[PDB]
């Protein structure tokens, strides 16, 4: 992996999470029996503008960037107990990343942070459509040749479609992760390449999941603030970013990751959190208090095959960045049993989200208002 | 007997009477030292340009209002509370005071959509002339309008509400005994006076509560379809309308009923169901399945003094008319334990609403999606 | 022709402005369809029997008549509106007769309810259709149930690219009965076959559109209360059911109707009304009062190709059954100009919905609160 | 001068002053015959187990509260209104009355999530000791807590509100002049006292209103980011903070400011923006595009007396901090005419909020999606 500065795995999964991943993968693998295989890829578009020509080495640099994130997701999913699942890239005969070029005949003065997303997305749609790729049904990364004050840094999508936006900078490459010269030059690469890994997670349907007591020496959760520590373990003794078991549970049912072209149900709907959702119900639901935590057990009514369940604790304020999450697998009857803790929590009230993970890639969510103390 | 006082045609289950006594003890402790209320249910009679008042309306609605007043008093007592009910504004002869309001529009200039707002505005002006603010009181607005033009509606909460009805020739609770045909004349009075008693319940903040397995021989729940059986026990062979124990629990914290002028909290807000609501939370919540039922137990976190909790089971479709409810009291720590059943239910999915009753007249509600079978 | 399935006549004449709108909308849609794949979609039919509920006699021939009657109706009504005779295609065998998939549910009627018959029959339809390679989650389907009233489902729900309609069979139900004045009854056949045509409109994404001043002698709008007058002509002074021009405009972008397999955008989302929606905006928007009406003109900002616009006037109460609608086409710049009236309206307040019709089958909707008088 | 009174460092545009004069004439007629208000903004100082009161807090917060009081008065007057501001509870010496409350919890048992509710509960009990109901008054809760634990928040509406802030050693408006470092001491005092003035605006029901093209040399709008420039004149660092004309219009109907005890209507409800709202409707509404702007004119249907109207332009993202607003008065028929601009805007889509200001202190709001260019 050294050619694209492959990141190491700087954490060890808890045995309960590894057992959850193996059971979820067994349930998903049975569901995948007999279904068509997926040929989906994460496509990359580079968008230039009238006074904004392409930056040097962008084809080689983004071959390194995408392959670094690709290997990262692969290595992190494996560290969680899944196979090394990750998105595939469109590669040329030499194994280098295919990059679609798009140009927008507008000067930067006619652009804004509000319009750079839609304008670059339309440009990406046109060039991708010319090669038979529908941006409305695929996962795409849109790279903009724009500066921070105008260009977009955003990610949004779900299991069957998503778009991520980023901006290129001169010499941006994962090889800079080791450079401690000059705010440092590794931290700069950490911010933007880690941000892209984070925004791509959103395009796969992942919300925010912050750090939790069960992983104090694992680095920062990628979907929390791990976008600021991605690859920082290669300099100055840092802890890096790890993919939370709950996020690995969610990605396991994404066709782009599991290589199986499952079909979405007609009632799959957007919700307040990222992803697509369907109605669910409980035959049994129990929230039992413990010291600085909660034991959540019950029985999901299986209207459809489902493989797992994810509980989030979310203090009021600060969006979902300060949340922590715990995963669990569902047996053949839909029963689950997990404990989620917040040691030393003094906020009293806290929001609990409960998300059932369906094999058809949708989710079912309920929200419960909980009081927690010692 | 002068206003044809209705009998009490049902017996409360012992557990519900014990809940009412425990709830009344909690409310009485909360009421210690608070100012007493002088609130009344005010009555306005609205005429229109070509629509003069019907004969005997002052005597007839003196009978109607005292009949509904005595019913609520008798039903609250049958539930285990004191005979709580709304007070009336009476003149020196002990007769109901009725404010006359006039709308300078012919009946042809009216509609079912505008009759409500227009008559309410006319009621505001006449009530303001006597120093009574319609925006902070409970009022019954009687319109001299025929069916299909006039309003029959009720809406409000614990500290304000308005009920709308239309007068008809000879409408009097004495007609409950009349078996002559006009639908007989007793059934007609049952429909209209029962509708007023039902819609007045809405003005107090009550949603719909249909009939339940725990009361098969009590008549029809007033807030279900008991508006069509109110007072029908006085003829033929009918079971009348009874005030559901869960509705009695909610009304006990209404100042108009308990005679105590408590203050509403600043965050009291309207919701999907009638009434005003504030946030709540649970320290423990358990929904345990039983045959054709569910046991709901847990511990409410008491951010404020609270006296009871009401669970509703509501099959999809048909609004909340087909719901059934079970009440329970809260101890000093917020603990509750109830069981709610739906015998023979084959619908599978059923909605469960859980409403904590706060002493400050607000409620805290959650909704859970539940699967139920045998 | 069409006498074999008792083809209905066209008992109304479109207003010239609406036919001109339809032609402009079809020109815009036709340009958008250039180069897009052709559609092979069909309206599939499933017949579900139960343990003590065997199939009724002649159901294969009767529903060949029923489905072909509704098919010819939509074709004739779309043509009467100024479009080509657009309609759904059916799956026919070598003899040209309707294909009906047989499904059996091994459950007695005592194991059914009005809440579960819908979902249970859908699951049975899913299993049998999958056996023939038909995914119920990506097609329009009619599920015919061998269940009686009060237990069986009568429902329609869906959008442009998927939908399901539910109905129940009754002995001898056939469109030939439209002429029968005995008692079977003609009104009986009108109600059930008209309900199916109406509910199929829901499955295509249509909400309710009641009758309007601009069509007083056209019969009852199918999506209003026309389900109760469908085919009531050919029986004495009946005026039938007509397809509102606004409903014809909406169906013209449905692949099942226009035969073009357009792709839905990723952000297509469900809303408060039936159909799928995307964000939109206006460059200019003017609501000018007229006597008992409103002039609505402006300029839609074209984020995507759009062909038409539909305005709804909806008095409060009574759901959207009492609404009236007016259509208008969009020029190449997004300009529109329409007038919508409600003569003699006395409600004062009225809700106005404005829905831009996109060529990709989605819509964009805003709601405005309007006061209207003479 | 004793409390370092701020100057007026901006001049209102003539059209806005005429709007204020017209709005105040309309409000004054509505106030005729209504009872006078004796409301005051009460101040509570909350200490904790290991957090004793800081030195001189009574004199320092007498200076802080009178400074904000004089600020609102001078700014309301500079806007064209009378010098409206909140009244304070003063002792015999004319010094601010500060209620002392104690929380029996060490700082280690506190958090940013609980500091608000816990200190609010402590303030409720002590204010109740003097007959002041926190649920029906405006209160400022000053906490003896450090940053990261203590609360800085404001929330409320016209008839009730609560502001939260934290005390710091030596915090006094006299520090506005100090240019020594701590990052200077005037900037520190500006942030904390400006935050309090800003959060108190939220407690009065004001959302965010950022800066606009019509006031480029007036400083920063208080309800935008003016909390960070409050008092910047007194040390020649910048132009300070000014009260936007749209905010002055909203505050003019607040009893705490106008001294008239008007009654809130029963249907006053919270919404997505701060304040309480009632339904409204338009007889005419026109949004006419101009170069880099929009002309908004029409006729509000007056269901109740209304005095003004406020338009917000809000680009997507960044919350409402980057919005700009324009005010306009309503004549006796509800007619209004304003123009709101965003020069050089390149984002295309922009959100427009339209808020009718009712004399009973509530508002009526609609939201329109607008496309804007040159
Ligand atoms: Ca949070
Ligand atoms: Ca129901
Ligand atoms: Ca309606
Ligand atoms: Ca914004
Ligand atoms: Na390691
Ligand atoms: Na640059
Ligand atoms: Na570093
Ligand atoms: Na970034
Ligand atoms: Na009459
Ligand atoms: Na009877
Ligand atoms: Na059991
Ligand atoms: Na019949
Ligand atoms: Na007939
Ligand atoms: Na959706
Ligand atoms: Na919508
Ligand atoms: Na601050
Ligand atoms: Zn993020
Ligand atoms: Zn009702
Ligand atoms: Zn319908
Ligand atoms: Zn703020």
Judged by a CB distance cut-off of 8 A, whether residue A283 touches chain B is yes
HEC sequence for D229-295: CCCCHHHCCCCCEECCHHHHHHHCCCHHHHCECCCCCCCCEECCCCCEECCCEEEEEEEEEECCEEE
Of D73, D60, D205, the closest CA to residue D138 belongs to D205
Residues near C143 by beta carbon (within 8 Å), at least 6 away in sequence: C46, C48, C121, C122, C125, C153, C164, C165, C166, C167
d(CA B140, CA B146): 17
D48, D114, D313, D351: best to mutate for the A interface, most A CBs within 10 A: D114
Residue D96 vs residues B101, D61, D67, D71: alpha-carbon distances, Å: 49, 8, 12, 16
Which of C113, C116, C317 is closest, CB to CB, to B113?
C317
d(CA D170, CA D140): 19
- Asked if B109 and C346 come within 8 Å (Cβ–Cβ), the reply is yes
A346, A350, A351, A372: best to mutate for the D interface, most D CBs within 10 A: A346
Which of C113, C316, C346 is closest, CB to CB, to B347?
C113
Judged by a CB distance cut-off of 8 A, whether residue A345 touches chain B is no
The two tokens of residue A193 are 């390449």
Place of tokens 């050294």: A2
D288, D293, D294, D301: best to mutate for the C interface, most C CBs within 10 A: D301
Of A35, A301, A38, the closest CA to residue C135 belongs to A35
d(CA C215, CA D174): 75
**CA-based nearest distance D373→chain C, Å:** 9
Residues near B254 by beta carbon (within 8 Å), at least 6 away in sequence: B158, B204, B205, B361
Give the angle C193-C198-C204 at the CA atoms, nearest 5°.
Answer: 130
Residues near A270 by beta carbon (within 8 Å), at least 6 away in sequence: A158, A276, A277, C269
Which of C282, C286, C348 is closest, CB to CB, to D369?
C282
Strands (E), B229-275: 241-242, 269-270
Burial bucket for residue A184 (CB in 10 Å: 0-12, 13-18, 19+):
middle
d(CA A305, CA A316): 33
Structure obtained using: X-ray
Shortest-distance ligand to the CA of residue B225 = 18
The dihedral formed by the CA atoms of D254, D259, D263 and D269, expressed in degrees to the nearest 10: 10
d(CA D17, CA D82): 11
Q: How far is the CA of A335 from the centre of ligand 11 (A)?
A: 12
DSSP secondary structure letter of residue B161: E
Residues 23-62 on A with a CB inside 8 Å of D are: none
- Domains, chain D, with CATH or none: 14-251 (3.40.390), 264-371 (2.60.40.10)
Shortest-distance ligand to the CA of residue C365 = 15
Point out which residues pair with A221 in neighbouring strands.
A242
DSSP secondary structure letter of residue A135: G
Instruction: Answer whether A356's CB lies under 8 Å from A364's CB.
Output: yes
Instruction: Answer whether A323's CB lies under 8 Å from A314's CB.
Output: yes
Neighbours of C365 (CB within 10 A): 17
The dihedral formed by the CA atoms of C198, C204, C208 and C209, expressed in degrees to the nearest 10: -90
The two tokens of residue C160 are 């442009």
Residues whose CB is under 5 A from ligand 2 (ion)? Answer: B 314-315, 318, 322
Of A175, A136, A127, A173, the closest CA to residue A157 belongs to A136
H or E element, residue A134: none
Instruction: Answer whether A100's CB lies under 8 Å from A134's CB.
Output: no
Chains with 3 or more CB pairs under 8 A to chain D: A, B, C
Judged by a CB distance cut-off of 8 A, whether residue A272 touches chain C is no
- Asked if A281 and B349 come within 8 Å (Cβ–Cβ), the reply is yes
Shortest-distance ligand to the CA of residue D315 = 4
| Chain A neighbors of B348, CB-CB under 8 A | 301
- Asked if A269 and C270 come within 8 Å (Cβ–Cβ), the reply is yes
Strands (E), chain B: 41-48, 99-103, 138-143, 153-157, 160-166, 220-221, 241-242, 269-270, 276-277, 282-290, 293-300, 306-314, 324-329, 335-341, 349-358, 363-371
Q: How far is the CA of D318 from the centre of ligand 14 (A)?
A: 24
Residue D38 vs residues D81, D84, D141, D258: alpha-carbon distances, Å: 20, 14, 20, 10
Judged by a CB distance cut-off of 8 A, whether residue B113 touches chain C is yes
d(CA C348, CA C345): 7
Instruction: Answer whether D330's CB lies under 8 Å from D309's CB.
Output: yes
Shortest-distance ligand to the CA of residue C352 = 3
The two tokens of residue A321 are 């960045």
The dihedral formed by the CA atoms of D193, D194, D196 and D199, expressed in degrees to the nearest 10: 180
Residues near C202 by beta carbon (within 8 Å), at least 6 away in sequence: C155, C156, C157, C158, C163, C165, C274
C280, C299, C301: best to mutate for the D interface, most D CBs within 10 A: C301
Of D291, C114, A34, the closest CA to residue B317 belongs to C114
Q: Chain C residue closest to A266 (CA)?
A: C137
The two tokens of residue B105 are 């529009």
B220-221/B241-242 β-pairing: parallel
Residues near B100 by beta carbon (within 8 Å), at least 6 away in sequence: B44, B45, B47, B53, B126
d(CA D28, CA D266): 22
d(CA A23, CA A21): 6
C50, C115, C117, C314: best to mutate for the B interface, most B CBs within 10 A: C115
**CA-based nearest distance D113→chain A, Å:** 5
- Asked if B269 and D270 come within 8 Å (Cβ–Cβ), the reply is yes
DSSP secondary structure letter of residue A50: T
Residues whose CB is under 5 A from ligand 1 (ion)? Answer: A 314-315, 318, 322
Give the angle B163-B169-B172 at the CA atoms, nearest 5°.
Answer: 65
d(CA D96, CA D2): 14
| Chain A neighbors of C264, CB-CB under 8 A | 136
Point out which residues pair with B103 in neighbouring strands.
B48
What strands, in cross-sheet order, belong to the sheet with A99-104? A99-104, A42-49, A139-144, A161-167, A154-158
Residue C310 vs residues A247, C209, C325, C363, C364: alpha-carbon distances, Å: 43, 11, 7, 10, 10
CB pairs under 8 A between C and D: 64
Instruction: Answer whether D97's CB lies under 8 Å from D90's CB.
Output: yes
Instruction: Answer whether C187's CB lies under 8 Å from C290's CB.
Output: no
Instruction: Answer whether D226's CB lies under 8 Å from D6's CB.
Output: no
| Chain A neighbors of C263, CB-CB under 8 A | 134, 136-137
d(CA B122, CA A179): 79
The two tokens of residue A102 are 């798009």
B324-329/B306-314 β-pairing: antiparallel
Judged by a CB distance cut-off of 8 A, whether residue A269 touches chain C is yes
The dihedral formed by the CA atoms of D130, D135, D138 and D144, expressed in degrees to the nearest 10: 70
Neighbours of B311 (CB within 10 A): 22
Of A120, A172, A171, the closest CA to residue A146 belongs to A120
Judged by a CB distance cut-off of 8 A, whether residue B346 touches chain A is no
Residues near D94 by beta carbon (within 8 Å), at least 6 away in sequence: none
DSSP secondary structure letter of residue A84: -
Residues in chain C: 374
Instruction: Answer whether B123's CB lies under 8 Å from B133's CB.
Output: no
Judged by a CB distance cut-off of 8 A, whether residue B264 touches chain D is yes
Neighbours of D199 (CB within 10 A): 22
d(CA A107, CA A115): 13
- Asked if C347 and B111 come within 8 Å (Cβ–Cβ), the reply is yes
d(CA B178, CA B157): 35
Instruction: Answer whether D364's CB lies under 8 Å from D333's CB.
Output: no
Q: Is the dihedral of CA A196, A202, A204, A208 positive or negative?
A: positive
Q: How far is the CA of B225 from the centre of ligand 18 (A)?
A: 8
Judged by a CB distance cut-off of 8 A, whether residue C305 touches chain A is no
Q: How far is the CA of D245 from the centre of ligand 2 (A)?
A: 49
Instruction: Answer whether B87's CB lies under 8 Å from B96's CB.
Output: no
Instruction: Please give the backbone phi and psi of residue D46, each rounded to the nearest 5 degrees, phi first.
Output: -110, 120
d(CA D29, CA D31): 5
Q: How far is the CA of B146 from the centre of ligand 9 (A)?
A: 5
d(CA C314, CA B113): 11
């Amino acid at each position: 992996g050294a050619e694209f500065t492959r990141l190491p795995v700087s954490w060890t999964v808890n045995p309960r999470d590894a057992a959850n991943a193996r059971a979820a993968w067994k349930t998903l693998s049975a569901y995948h029996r007999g279904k068509p295989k997926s040929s989906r890829k994460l496509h990359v578009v580079y968008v230039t503008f009238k006074d904004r020509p392409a930056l040097e080495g962008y084809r080689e640099r983004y071959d390194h960037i995408l392959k670094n994130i690709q290997a990262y997701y692969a290595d992190q999913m494996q560290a969680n107990g899944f196979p090394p699942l990750t998105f595939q890239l469109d590669l040329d005969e030499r194994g280098k990343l295919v990059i679609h070029d798009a140009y927008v005949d507008k000067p930067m003065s006619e652009m804004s942070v509000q319009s750079s997303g839609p304008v670059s997305r339309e440009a990406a749609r046109k060039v991708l459509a010319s090669k038979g790729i529908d941006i409305e049904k695929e996962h795409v990364l849109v790279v903009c040749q724009l500066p921070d004050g105008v260009g977009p840094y955003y990610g949004g999508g779900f299991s069957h479609q998503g778009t991520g936006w980023t901006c290129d900078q001169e010499g941006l490459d994962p090889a800079s992760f080791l450079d401690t010269e000059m705010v440092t030059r590794g931290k700069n690469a950490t911010i933007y390449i880690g941000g892209t890994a984070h925004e791509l997670g959103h395009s796969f349907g992942l919300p925010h999941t912050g750090d939790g007591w069960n992983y104090p020496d694992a680095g920062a959760s990628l979907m929390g603030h791990g976008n600021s520590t991605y690859g920082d373990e290669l300099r100055h003794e840092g802890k890096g970013a790890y993919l939370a078991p709950t996020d690995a549970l969610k990605l396991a049912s994404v066709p782009l990751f599991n290589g199986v072209e499952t079909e979405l149900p007609a009632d799959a709907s957007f919700g307040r959190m990222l992803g697509k959702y369907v109605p669910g119900s409980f035959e049994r639901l129990e929230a039992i208090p413990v010291k600085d935590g909660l034991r959540l057990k019950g029985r999901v009514h299986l209207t459809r095959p489902a493989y797992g369940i994810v509980a989030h604790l979310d203090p009021p304020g600060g969006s979902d960045y300060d949340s922590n999450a715990v995963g669990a697998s569902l047996d053949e009857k839909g029963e689950f049993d997990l404990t989620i803790c917040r040691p030393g929590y003094k906020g009293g009230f806290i929001e609990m989200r409960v998300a059932v993970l369906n094999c058809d890639s949708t989710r079912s969510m309920i929200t419960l208002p909980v009081w927690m103390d010692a």
